[PDB]
């Protein structure tokens, strides 16, 4: 049987990676066969599309079950889960259980929000392909086979971009200073940063009165959001509102002000000096930092030094798991009595007559 | 001169702490004088109100400037900043510069989101008053004088609450199992958790068909938000919607399902077994964890291993600071050229022909 590769892509970015992977493999094995969940680019390269990438939830669970069986029957030489970790990691695990060799393409950095998920990746995969070196170093800490392959955007973007050519595309004068404002691809980011970014540009106009200001907006919604904010904050500030074209804007500009994330890497490859501005809910940042630091989020467990009360976070905060955790407690029996007694002990440990303690602290210092 | 204490409270919770502190001090010094920013409870105990607590932004900056001068003239024996860290920490610093002894009451855990702010607290204060032991242990790590005084809520809540009395207040039958649902005091929490909490209760009704469900809602907005979600998720689930009364609901219930935060402590003091459910943006949790782990958030600095590009986060993401950071870059001179060359070096380090690397990884495993 000729080399047969199973692929699953779940988004346009993954379809691009998959098509590039197919082309490179056909160079070494022109007879290779490719099947799975394919977008139009993978299909154009010959990927058999059992399902369309756009089809990636009830339906998703059904597809993953079907692929688990079919890939099980097929026994492909390798399975490559292309990104889409919420779908592919579990699938990679199901196939590894059947002895099939699995690769996960792209570090699921956001998805792997806790140690337990790193171990899930390692158990589900024979190898992880990581774009960046510090991602490989991360998995090195866990004896998880990971190969640093470089970043495809670095292959696609030249070392020395043409600033003047980008300015010609955007109609930006070559003699003017030019500032790129990337308020973010997410609504939360745009809402948090757009006003401050506009005020920043207003301040800079005081020094550079002919400063060109280009604003690449990823989609119509984010655009309408930005115009709304601008109308209330800086109605008289003339700017270039662009539909996409963030790459052109950054290659063209002399500096960029970015929310953060993928833009900062693309900006680096554009050779545009940048300043990164970001703002997040302080309350949740504290919770996260609390968790990273202790594995807990709730005060009873911090006071007890153990998982005294059950904490179900993120994907574990789900009805079935919540109900299973509450059922022993609603029984109002032995378990509830033991938690009751520990609660009384901790209550006593922090019952100190704080008003008097504070009053004494004042009097000592005085 | 009789003992003279300066106090600043900025919210109702701080007014309660301040009034309790005033009463305890008057026990030891009935002639003591109290002045500053006082709510109605502090005033009732005799606190001279130079400003009303409700007045705590342009106006806030003006008040803090005025208090910096006046407290400077007064030279109070002690200044106590009662919570409100965004106002009081800077004020405590201004007064310490004048030799005045300062105490900050209540650990500013959320406000102190990074090391630099812990050092700010230590420089601004002679002592921090912390409700909880792990908060004191935190400041012990930084040689920041901190006194663990216990939690005032533990003083106010009895060790053995009366479940049946709370049920009588709420009209809950004594023979029924009762579940408290606290979907959160913030709109983001209610939106994220209300549906899953309702579905959880629906599942539990399958085992406890007479289960009472009490939902304490902090305000009318959060209430309207919850009813809206319930109308779409569980219109036929009968529940008790309460205006506040979270304490009564928890003392009364046999178990509680809580978003998290202050509720979990109050639930512990209510002797109600609990399950903590929480959900936050994965993307921002990763950023935070990224920062906690490295001090950076942007990919260029992670690749460089230093602050190659300026990152201005949270309170530093402000127009004046953003503009000052962009001005050297817009100059498009020596600095921009050095960042350009480093960008080209990092670009080369991750330009590896990833498609071919990935293809080779597949072929090896096959
Ligand atoms: O304010 C902005 C923020 C981002 N982008 C562009 O949007 C693309 C995708 O950004 P995203 O944050 O969505 O990266 P992802 O999460 O998809 O990897 C990037 O090429 C950016 O250049 C933009 O045009 N304006
Ligand atoms: O879904 C909820 C969540 C909280 N609370 C109550 O709201 C009070 C204040 O909660 P918060 O989270 O605002 O604590 P804070 O941040 O003010 O310290 C607490 O006593 C809780 O019992 C409630 O009644 N329903």
mmCIF file of N, CA and C in Angstrom, chain B residues 14-131:
data_model
loop_
_atom_site.group_PDB
_atom_site.id
_atom_site.type_symbol
_atom_site.label_atom_id
_atom_site.label_comp_id
_atom_site.label_asym_id
_atom_site.label_seq_id
_atom_site.Cartn_x
_atom_site.Cartn_y
_atom_site.Cartn_z
ATOM 1 N N UNK B 14 -15.340 50.089 53.118
ATOM 2 C CA UNK B 14 -14.320 50.808 53.864
ATOM 3 C C UNK B 14 -14.892 51.677 54.965
ATOM 4 N N UNK B 15 -16.080 52.239 54.747
ATOM 5 C CA UNK B 15 -16.737 53.007 55.799
ATOM 6 C C UNK B 15 -17.056 52.119 56.996
ATOM 7 N N UNK B 16 -17.451 50.873 56.740
ATOM 8 C CA UNK B 16 -17.729 49.944 57.829
ATOM 9 C C UNK B 16 -16.450 49.640 58.594
ATOM 10 N N UNK B 17 -15.377 49.309 57.873
ATOM 11 C CA UNK B 17 -14.090 49.085 58.524
ATOM 12 C C UNK B 17 -13.657 50.306 59.318
ATOM 13 N N UNK B 18 -13.812 51.497 58.736
ATOM 14 C CA UNK B 18 -13.378 52.706 59.416
ATOM 15 C C UNK B 18 -14.160 52.970 60.687
ATOM 16 N N UNK B 19 -15.478 52.763 60.642
ATOM 17 C CA UNK B 19 -16.290 52.967 61.836
ATOM 18 C C UNK B 19 -15.903 51.982 62.930
ATOM 19 N N UNK B 20 -15.657 50.725 62.561
ATOM 20 C CA UNK B 20 -15.224 49.749 63.547
ATOM 21 C C UNK B 20 -13.866 50.085 64.129
ATOM 22 N N UNK B 21 -12.957 50.587 63.291
ATOM 23 C CA UNK B 21 -11.643 50.992 63.777
ATOM 24 C C UNK B 21 -11.752 52.183 64.716
ATOM 25 N N UNK B 22 -12.635 53.132 64.400
ATOM 26 C CA UNK B 22 -12.821 54.301 65.255
ATOM 27 C C UNK B 22 -13.345 53.878 66.622
ATOM 28 N N UNK B 23 -14.346 52.994 66.643
ATOM 29 C CA UNK B 23 -14.917 52.564 67.915
ATOM 30 C C UNK B 23 -13.868 51.877 68.782
ATOM 31 N N UNK B 24 -13.097 50.960 68.196
ATOM 32 C CA UNK B 24 -12.095 50.240 68.976
ATOM 33 C C UNK B 24 -11.035 51.190 69.524
ATOM 34 N N UNK B 25 -10.652 52.202 68.742
ATOM 35 C CA UNK B 25 -9.643 53.147 69.208
ATOM 36 C C UNK B 25 -10.184 54.023 70.330
ATOM 37 N N UNK B 26 -11.418 54.509 70.191
ATOM 38 C CA UNK B 26 -12.025 55.307 71.251
ATOM 39 C C UNK B 26 -12.096 54.551 72.571
ATOM 40 N N UNK B 27 -12.111 53.215 72.537
ATOM 41 C CA UNK B 27 -12.057 52.449 73.779
ATOM 42 C C UNK B 27 -10.760 52.721 74.528
ATOM 43 N N UNK B 28 -9.648 52.821 73.803
ATOM 44 C CA UNK B 28 -8.346 53.060 74.414
ATOM 45 C C UNK B 28 -8.015 54.542 74.532
ATOM 46 N N UNK B 29 -8.586 55.379 73.670
ATOM 47 C CA UNK B 29 -8.306 56.814 73.659
ATOM 48 C C UNK B 29 -9.605 57.562 73.384
ATOM 49 N N UNK B 30 -10.488 57.720 74.374
ATOM 50 C CA UNK B 30 -11.765 58.405 74.110
ATOM 51 C C UNK B 30 -11.601 59.809 73.558
ATOM 52 N N UNK B 31 -10.454 60.447 73.781
ATOM 53 C CA UNK B 31 -10.201 61.803 73.313
ATOM 54 C C UNK B 31 -9.635 61.852 71.902
ATOM 55 N N UNK B 32 -9.491 60.706 71.239
ATOM 56 C CA UNK B 32 -8.849 60.672 69.934
ATOM 57 C C UNK B 32 -9.646 61.485 68.921
ATOM 58 N N UNK B 33 -8.932 62.051 67.955
ATOM 59 C CA UNK B 33 -9.523 62.840 66.884
ATOM 60 C C UNK B 33 -9.373 62.090 65.568
ATOM 61 N N UNK B 34 -10.389 62.189 64.715
ATOM 62 C CA UNK B 34 -10.402 61.463 63.454
ATOM 63 C C UNK B 34 -10.872 62.390 62.347
ATOM 64 N N UNK B 35 -10.147 62.387 61.229
ATOM 65 C CA UNK B 35 -10.420 63.295 60.124
ATOM 66 C C UNK B 35 -9.993 62.627 58.829
ATOM 67 N N UNK B 36 -10.636 63.011 57.744
ATOM 68 C CA UNK B 36 -10.213 62.591 56.429
ATOM 69 C C UNK B 36 -11.416 62.422 55.510
ATOM 70 N N UNK B 37 -11.402 61.325 54.762
ATOM 71 C CA UNK B 37 -12.474 60.971 53.840
ATOM 72 C C UNK B 37 -13.332 59.921 54.529
ATOM 73 N N UNK B 38 -14.535 60.315 54.936
ATOM 74 C CA UNK B 38 -15.365 59.503 55.813
ATOM 75 C C UNK B 38 -16.742 59.296 55.208
ATOM 76 N N UNK B 39 -17.240 58.067 55.314
ATOM 77 C CA UNK B 39 -18.623 57.791 55.023
ATOM 78 C C UNK B 39 -19.506 58.107 56.209
ATOM 79 N N UNK B 40 -20.805 57.845 56.052
ATOM 80 C CA UNK B 40 -21.744 58.196 57.130
ATOM 81 C C UNK B 40 -21.478 57.455 58.430
ATOM 82 N N UNK B 41 -21.000 56.210 58.373
ATOM 83 C CA UNK B 41 -20.749 55.463 59.603
ATOM 84 C C UNK B 41 -19.540 56.015 60.344
ATOM 85 N N UNK B 42 -18.460 56.320 59.621
ATOM 86 C CA UNK B 42 -17.306 56.953 60.250
ATOM 87 C C UNK B 42 -17.684 58.305 60.840
ATOM 88 N N UNK B 43 -18.500 59.082 60.120
ATOM 89 C CA UNK B 43 -18.936 60.375 60.639
ATOM 90 C C UNK B 43 -19.761 60.204 61.905
ATOM 91 N N UNK B 44 -20.674 59.230 61.917
ATOM 92 C CA UNK B 44 -21.477 58.992 63.111
ATOM 93 C C UNK B 44 -20.598 58.685 64.316
ATOM 94 N N UNK B 45 -19.454 58.037 64.100
ATOM 95 C CA UNK B 45 -18.508 57.780 65.178
ATOM 96 C C UNK B 45 -17.621 58.981 65.482
ATOM 97 N N UNK B 46 -17.802 60.095 64.776
ATOM 98 C CA UNK B 46 -17.083 61.316 65.064
ATOM 99 C C UNK B 46 -15.986 61.677 64.088
ATOM 100 N N UNK B 47 -15.892 61.000 62.946
ATOM 101 C CA UNK B 47 -14.833 61.309 61.994
ATOM 102 C C UNK B 47 -15.137 62.628 61.298
ATOM 103 N N UNK B 48 -14.228 63.581 61.441
ATOM 104 C CA UNK B 48 -14.300 64.819 60.684
ATOM 105 C C UNK B 48 -14.224 64.501 59.193
ATOM 106 N N UNK B 49 -15.214 64.957 58.428
ATOM 107 C CA UNK B 49 -15.308 64.620 57.007
ATOM 108 C C UNK B 49 -14.874 65.826 56.177
ATOM 109 N N UNK B 50 -13.567 65.924 55.927
ATOM 110 C CA UNK B 50 -13.080 66.896 54.954
ATOM 111 C C UNK B 50 -13.689 66.633 53.586
ATOM 112 N N UNK B 51 -13.868 65.361 53.244
ATOM 113 C CA UNK B 51 -14.568 64.959 52.038
ATOM 114 C C UNK B 51 -15.468 63.781 52.366
ATOM 115 N N UNK B 52 -16.523 63.632 51.574
ATOM 116 C CA UNK B 52 -17.398 62.479 51.693
ATOM 117 C C UNK B 52 -16.793 61.306 50.936
ATOM 118 N N UNK B 53 -16.892 60.117 51.531
ATOM 119 C CA UNK B 53 -16.389 58.917 50.877
ATOM 120 C C UNK B 53 -16.985 58.748 49.485
ATOM 121 N N UNK B 54 -18.227 59.192 49.286
ATOM 122 C CA UNK B 54 -18.869 59.023 47.990
ATOM 123 C C UNK B 54 -18.141 59.777 46.884
ATOM 124 N N UNK B 55 -17.374 60.813 47.226
ATOM 125 C CA UNK B 55 -16.663 61.581 46.211
ATOM 126 C C UNK B 55 -15.488 60.820 45.613
ATOM 127 N N UNK B 56 -15.166 59.636 46.128
ATOM 128 C CA UNK B 56 -14.135 58.789 45.534
ATOM 129 C C UNK B 56 -14.782 57.609 44.820
ATOM 130 N N UNK B 57 -9.389 60.036 37.341
ATOM 131 C CA UNK B 57 -10.468 60.995 37.551
ATOM 132 C C UNK B 57 -9.937 62.364 37.962
ATOM 133 N N UNK B 58 -10.513 63.413 37.372
ATOM 134 C CA UNK B 58 -10.062 64.772 37.653
ATOM 135 C C UNK B 58 -10.300 65.138 39.114
ATOM 136 N N UNK B 59 -11.545 65.007 39.574
ATOM 137 C CA UNK B 59 -11.875 65.397 40.940
ATOM 138 C C UNK B 59 -11.072 64.593 41.958
ATOM 139 N N UNK B 60 -10.922 63.283 41.739
ATOM 140 C CA UNK B 60 -10.154 62.466 42.677
ATOM 141 C C UNK B 60 -8.714 62.952 42.783
ATOM 142 N N UNK B 61 -8.085 63.255 41.645
ATOM 143 C CA UNK B 61 -6.730 63.793 41.674
ATOM 144 C C UNK B 61 -6.672 65.090 42.470
ATOM 145 N N UNK B 62 -7.656 65.972 42.278
ATOM 146 C CA UNK B 62 -7.694 67.222 43.032
ATOM 147 C C UNK B 62 -7.780 66.954 44.530
ATOM 148 N N UNK B 63 -8.654 66.029 44.937
ATOM 149 C CA UNK B 63 -8.825 65.732 46.359
ATOM 150 C C UNK B 63 -7.534 65.170 46.940
ATOM 151 N N UNK B 64 -6.917 64.220 46.235
ATOM 152 C CA UNK B 64 -5.681 63.624 46.731
ATOM 153 C C UNK B 64 -4.585 64.673 46.871
ATOM 154 N N UNK B 65 -4.542 65.638 45.952
ATOM 155 C CA UNK B 65 -3.583 66.730 46.079
ATOM 156 C C UNK B 65 -3.886 67.565 47.316
ATOM 157 N N UNK B 66 -5.159 67.912 47.515
ATOM 158 C CA UNK B 66 -5.537 68.708 48.677
ATOM 159 C C UNK B 66 -5.222 67.969 49.972
ATOM 160 N N UNK B 67 -5.547 66.675 50.032
ATOM 161 C CA UNK B 67 -5.271 65.900 51.237
ATOM 162 C C UNK B 67 -3.772 65.756 51.470
ATOM 163 N N UNK B 68 -2.995 65.583 50.398
ATOM 164 C CA UNK B 68 -1.541 65.530 50.535
ATOM 165 C C UNK B 68 -1.020 66.776 51.243
ATOM 166 N N UNK B 69 -1.508 67.951 50.845
ATOM 167 C CA UNK B 69 -1.089 69.186 51.501
ATOM 168 C C UNK B 69 -1.616 69.255 52.929
ATOM 169 N N UNK B 70 -2.930 69.096 53.103
ATOM 170 C CA UNK B 70 -3.539 69.299 54.414
ATOM 171 C C UNK B 70 -3.021 68.286 55.429
ATOM 172 N N UNK B 71 -3.059 66.995 55.090
ATOM 173 C CA UNK B 71 -2.444 66.003 55.967
ATOM 174 C C UNK B 71 -0.976 66.324 56.206
ATOM 175 N N UNK B 72 -0.297 66.886 55.203
ATOM 176 C CA UNK B 72 1.067 67.343 55.413
ATOM 177 C C UNK B 72 1.157 68.394 56.501
ATOM 178 N N UNK B 73 0.299 69.413 56.428
ATOM 179 C CA UNK B 73 0.250 70.419 57.486
ATOM 180 C C UNK B 73 -0.123 69.788 58.823
ATOM 181 N N UNK B 74 -1.175 68.966 58.832
ATOM 182 C CA UNK B 74 -1.688 68.425 60.085
ATOM 183 C C UNK B 74 -0.656 67.542 60.775
ATOM 184 N N UNK B 75 0.128 66.797 60.001
ATOM 185 C CA UNK B 75 1.083 65.836 60.541
ATOM 186 C C UNK B 75 0.377 64.887 61.512
ATOM 187 N N UNK B 76 -0.586 64.105 61.037
ATOM 188 C CA UNK B 76 -1.297 63.197 61.938
ATOM 189 C C UNK B 76 -0.373 62.126 62.488
ATOM 190 N N UNK B 77 -0.719 61.641 63.679
ATOM 191 C CA UNK B 77 0.057 60.574 64.299
ATOM 192 C C UNK B 77 0.142 59.364 63.380
ATOM 193 N N UNK B 78 -0.984 58.968 62.790
ATOM 194 C CA UNK B 78 -1.015 57.876 61.825
ATOM 195 C C UNK B 78 -2.012 58.224 60.730
ATOM 196 N N UNK B 79 -1.702 57.794 59.510
ATOM 197 C CA UNK B 79 -2.648 57.809 58.403
ATOM 198 C C UNK B 79 -3.003 56.373 58.051
ATOM 199 N N UNK B 80 -4.297 56.094 57.928
ATOM 200 C CA UNK B 80 -4.782 54.770 57.557
ATOM 201 C C UNK B 80 -5.534 54.906 56.240
ATOM 202 N N UNK B 81 -4.970 54.339 55.180
ATOM 203 C CA UNK B 81 -5.691 54.198 53.933
ATOM 204 C C UNK B 81 -6.534 52.946 53.992
ATOM 205 N N UNK B 82 -7.855 53.103 53.979
ATOM 206 C CA UNK B 82 -8.768 51.974 54.123
ATOM 207 C C UNK B 82 -9.105 51.495 52.717
ATOM 208 N N UNK B 83 -8.496 50.383 52.313
ATOM 209 C CA UNK B 83 -8.745 49.813 50.999
ATOM 210 C C UNK B 83 -8.559 50.895 49.937
ATOM 211 N N UNK B 84 -9.372 50.873 48.883
ATOM 212 C CA UNK B 84 -9.318 51.868 47.820
ATOM 213 C C UNK B 84 -7.873 52.089 47.364
ATOM 214 N N UNK B 85 -7.159 51.020 47.001
ATOM 215 C CA UNK B 85 -5.716 51.155 46.741
ATOM 216 C C UNK B 85 -5.378 52.104 45.608
ATOM 217 N N UNK B 86 -6.219 52.185 44.575
ATOM 218 C CA UNK B 86 -5.921 53.066 43.451
ATOM 219 C C UNK B 86 -5.856 54.525 43.871
ATOM 220 N N UNK B 87 -6.483 54.877 44.988
ATOM 221 C CA UNK B 87 -6.394 56.215 45.551
ATOM 222 C C UNK B 87 -5.376 56.297 46.680
ATOM 223 N N UNK B 88 -5.384 55.320 47.593
ATOM 224 C CA UNK B 88 -4.672 55.470 48.858
ATOM 225 C C UNK B 88 -3.186 55.141 48.765
ATOM 226 N N UNK B 89 -2.777 54.224 47.887
ATOM 227 C CA UNK B 89 -1.366 53.843 47.847
ATOM 228 C C UNK B 89 -0.511 55.041 47.458
ATOM 229 N N UNK B 90 -0.905 55.750 46.399
ATOM 230 C CA UNK B 90 -0.188 56.964 46.016
ATOM 231 C C UNK B 90 -0.215 57.993 47.138
ATOM 232 N N UNK B 91 -1.374 58.171 47.782
ATOM 233 C CA UNK B 91 -1.466 59.133 48.876
ATOM 234 C C UNK B 91 -0.557 58.725 50.025
ATOM 235 N N UNK B 92 -0.581 57.441 50.382
ATOM 236 C CA UNK B 92 0.317 56.931 51.411
ATOM 237 C C UNK B 92 1.769 57.219 51.060
ATOM 238 N N UNK B 93 2.117 57.123 49.776
ATOM 239 C CA UNK B 93 3.471 57.443 49.362
ATOM 240 C C UNK B 93 3.796 58.914 49.536
ATOM 241 N N UNK B 94 2.866 59.792 49.148
ATOM 242 C CA UNK B 94 3.089 61.227 49.302
ATOM 243 C C UNK B 94 3.304 61.596 50.765
ATOM 244 N N UNK B 95 2.555 60.968 51.671
ATOM 245 C CA UNK B 95 2.661 61.318 53.081
ATOM 246 C C UNK B 95 3.919 60.730 53.703
ATOM 247 N N UNK B 96 4.281 59.507 53.316
ATOM 248 C CA UNK B 96 5.508 58.905 53.820
ATOM 249 C C UNK B 96 6.718 59.753 53.448
ATOM 250 N N UNK B 97 6.689 60.361 52.263
ATOM 251 C CA UNK B 97 7.764 61.258 51.859
ATOM 252 C C UNK B 97 7.910 62.425 52.828
ATOM 253 N N UNK B 98 6.829 62.804 53.505
ATOM 254 C CA UNK B 98 6.847 63.874 54.493
ATOM 255 C C UNK B 98 7.137 63.370 55.903
ATOM 256 N N UNK B 99 7.474 62.092 56.059
ATOM 257 C CA UNK B 99 7.786 61.535 57.357
ATOM 258 C C UNK B 99 6.599 61.008 58.134
ATOM 259 N N UNK B 100 5.402 61.046 57.563
ATOM 260 C CA UNK B 100 4.202 60.630 58.277
ATOM 261 C C UNK B 100 4.103 59.111 58.264
ATOM 262 N N UNK B 101 3.659 58.548 59.385
ATOM 263 C CA UNK B 101 3.490 57.107 59.499
ATOM 264 C C UNK B 101 2.194 56.688 58.819
ATOM 265 N N UNK B 102 2.267 55.634 58.011
ATOM 266 C CA UNK B 102 1.152 55.222 57.172
ATOM 267 C C UNK B 102 0.863 53.741 57.365
ATOM 268 N N UNK B 103 -0.425 53.408 57.384
ATOM 269 C CA UNK B 103 -0.904 52.032 57.365
ATOM 270 C C UNK B 103 -1.866 51.900 56.197
ATOM 271 N N UNK B 104 -1.752 50.805 55.451
ATOM 272 C CA UNK B 104 -2.761 50.455 54.463
ATOM 273 C C UNK B 104 -3.561 49.276 54.991
ATOM 274 N N UNK B 105 -4.874 49.460 55.069
ATOM 275 C CA UNK B 105 -5.806 48.487 55.627
ATOM 276 C C UNK B 105 -6.423 47.697 54.475
ATOM 277 N N UNK B 106 -6.248 46.372 54.501
ATOM 278 C CA UNK B 106 -6.775 45.431 53.509
ATOM 279 C C UNK B 106 -5.737 45.192 52.416
ATOM 280 N N UNK B 107 -5.394 43.928 52.189
ATOM 281 C CA UNK B 107 -4.425 43.569 51.163
ATOM 282 C C UNK B 107 -4.952 43.945 49.780
ATOM 283 N N UNK B 108 -4.246 44.791 49.013
ATOM 284 C CA UNK B 108 -4.692 45.111 47.644
ATOM 285 C C UNK B 108 -4.309 44.027 46.639
ATOM 286 N N UNK B 109 -4.852 42.828 46.843
ATOM 287 C CA UNK B 109 -4.412 41.660 46.084
ATOM 288 C C UNK B 109 -4.606 41.857 44.584
ATOM 289 N N UNK B 110 -5.778 42.348 44.177
ATOM 290 C CA UNK B 110 -6.050 42.539 42.754
ATOM 291 C C UNK B 110 -5.196 43.669 42.196
ATOM 292 N N UNK B 111 -5.082 44.762 42.948
ATOM 293 C CA UNK B 111 -4.334 45.926 42.493
ATOM 294 C C UNK B 111 -2.855 45.602 42.314
ATOM 295 N N UNK B 112 -2.295 44.770 43.197
ATOM 296 C CA UNK B 112 -0.867 44.442 43.160
ATOM 297 C C UNK B 112 -0.624 43.279 42.194
ATOM 298 N N UNK B 113 -0.829 43.565 40.909
ATOM 299 C CA UNK B 113 -0.816 42.519 39.895
ATOM 300 C C UNK B 113 0.586 42.148 39.435
ATOM 301 N N UNK B 114 1.616 42.846 39.906
ATOM 302 C CA UNK B 114 2.979 42.546 39.501
ATOM 303 C C UNK B 114 3.924 42.944 40.626
ATOM 304 N N UNK B 115 5.130 42.377 40.575
ATOM 305 C CA UNK B 115 6.133 42.617 41.608
ATOM 306 C C UNK B 115 6.311 44.107 41.887
ATOM 307 N N UNK B 116 6.462 44.911 40.830
ATOM 308 C CA UNK B 116 6.735 46.333 41.013
ATOM 309 C C UNK B 116 5.709 47.000 41.919
ATOM 310 N N UNK B 117 4.458 46.542 41.885
ATOM 311 C CA UNK B 117 3.441 47.141 42.740
ATOM 312 C C UNK B 117 3.563 46.686 44.187
ATOM 313 N N UNK B 118 4.056 45.471 44.428
ATOM 314 C CA UNK B 118 4.331 45.063 45.802
ATOM 315 C C UNK B 118 5.371 45.989 46.417
ATOM 316 N N UNK B 119 6.455 46.249 45.684
ATOM 317 C CA UNK B 119 7.470 47.172 46.178
ATOM 318 C C UNK B 119 6.901 48.570 46.387
ATOM 319 N N UNK B 120 5.950 48.987 45.551
ATOM 320 C CA UNK B 120 5.280 50.268 45.773
ATOM 321 C C UNK B 120 4.555 50.279 47.113
ATOM 322 N N UNK B 121 3.828 49.201 47.419
ATOM 323 C CA UNK B 121 3.131 49.111 48.701
ATOM 324 C C UNK B 121 4.122 49.227 49.849
ATOM 325 N N UNK B 122 5.225 48.481 49.770
ATOM 326 C CA UNK B 122 6.205 48.509 50.842
ATOM 327 C C UNK B 122 6.829 49.879 51.035
ATOM 328 N N UNK B 123 7.126 50.575 49.933
ATOM 329 C CA UNK B 123 7.708 51.910 50.040
ATOM 330 C C UNK B 123 6.701 52.921 50.570
ATOM 331 N N UNK B 124 5.415 52.713 50.296
ATOM 332 C CA UNK B 124 4.391 53.682 50.662
ATOM 333 C C UNK B 124 3.881 53.519 52.087
ATOM 334 N N UNK B 125 4.106 52.368 52.713
ATOM 335 C CA UNK B 125 3.473 52.041 53.982
ATOM 336 C C UNK B 125 4.513 51.664 55.023
ATOM 337 N N UNK B 126 4.157 51.902 56.280
ATOM 338 C CA UNK B 126 4.879 51.330 57.404
ATOM 339 C C UNK B 126 4.342 49.958 57.777
ATOM 340 N N UNK B 127 3.075 49.682 57.464
ATOM 341 C CA UNK B 127 2.458 48.409 57.802
ATOM 342 C C UNK B 127 1.238 48.192 56.919
ATOM 343 N N UNK B 128 1.019 46.938 56.530
ATOM 344 C CA UNK B 128 -0.186 46.515 55.823
ATOM 345 C C UNK B 128 -0.991 45.619 56.753
ATOM 346 N N UNK B 129 -2.293 45.864 56.828
ATOM 347 C CA UNK B 129 -3.204 45.020 57.594
ATOM 348 C C UNK B 129 -3.895 44.060 56.636
ATOM 349 N N UNK B 130 -3.733 42.761 56.881
ATOM 350 C CA UNK B 130 -4.245 41.713 56.008
ATOM 351 C C UNK B 130 -5.268 40.862 56.747
ATOM 352 N N UNK B 131 -6.400 40.597 56.088
ATOM 353 C CA UNK B 131 -7.456 39.783 56.683
ATOM 354 C C UNK B 131 -7.047 38.324 56.837
#
